[PDB]
Amino acid sequence: MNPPPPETSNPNKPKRQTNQLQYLLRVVLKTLWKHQFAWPFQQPVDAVKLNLPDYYKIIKTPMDMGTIKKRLENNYYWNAQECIQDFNTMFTNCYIYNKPGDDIVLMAEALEKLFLQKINELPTE
Ligand SMILES: Cc1cc2ccnc(N[C@@H]3CCNC[C@H]3C(=O)NC3CCCCC3)c2[nH]c1=O
């Protein structure tokens, strides 16, 4: 009932190492990954195990920090904006699927506030 996870490597997709992508792995992801609210976002939503049968009927662009971590580790991104877009997709999915008063929404809001603080101090290329 789960889709395959988002791709985290591609032999055809070009790759480079930049200080901005290094900052996103070493500072931004690392900060969010170890946060007390990170754990529901550390892997793709398992709709079977979590008993959320409608999840992938509603969310057609799934994204999670486990996938973002692998993409950064695998040099999948060419630029920082591709990675920032994936974080925004993850937060947006959470706000669309869940009810406004749900604890997962409060957890996502806390992580997004921390995320935007760290992106505000992104170093120049
Ligand atoms: C990404 C993600 C994961 C997830 C896991 C479990 N449940 C979710 N949604 C609950 C649906 C029912 N109402 C309560 C919702 C909720 O806020 N659950 C949280 C999960 C984390 C621990 C506190 C309770 C999920 N929704 C997601 O978007």
Side-chain angles (χ1 to χ4, degrees), residues 5-124:
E7 79 168 3
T8 51
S9 68
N10 187 335
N12 293 320
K13 197 180 186 297
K15 52 197 192 172
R16 64 178 182 168
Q17 307 223 338
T18 76
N19 63 296
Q20 282 194 340
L21 282 169
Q22 281 168 6
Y23 173 86
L24 281 163
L25 183 57
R26 293 184 182 182
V27 178
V28 180
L29 179 60
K30 190 149 284 176
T31 297
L32 266 71
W33 186 267
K34 282 305 190 56
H35 193 281
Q36 61 268 26
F37 294 162
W39 62 270
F41 303 100
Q42 283 178 339
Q43 60 285 313
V45 170
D46 189 336
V48 175
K49 280 198 187 289
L50 294 170
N51 190 18
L52 303 173
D54 68 334
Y55 187 80
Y56 290 109
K57 303 187 188 295
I58 295 173
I59 300 301
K60 303 305 188 180
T61 322
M63 188 51 56
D64 65 279
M65 291 202 292
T67 299
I68 296 167
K69 187 168 180 287
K70 286 183 186 193
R71 286 181 170 192
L72 284 166
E73 287 170 344
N74 300 347
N75 307 304
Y76 180 85
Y77 302 123
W78 187 260
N79 66 50
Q81 289 309 315
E82 287 177 278
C83 179
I84 291 165
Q85 185 181 306
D86 282 348
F87 274 102
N88 275 310
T89 297
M90 180 181 78
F91 295 132
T92 300
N93 291 343
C94 187
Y95 305 148
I96 289 172
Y97 177 72
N98 304 281
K99 303 195 289 286
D102 288 349
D103 279 335
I104 195 71
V105 171
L106 296 177
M107 292 164 82
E109 284 173 335
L111 294 171
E112 184 180 6
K113 183 175 177 184
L114 191 53
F115 172 71
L116 286 171
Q117 282 165 356
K118 295 290 173 176
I119 293 297
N120 216 54
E121 48 190 45
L122 186 72
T124 314

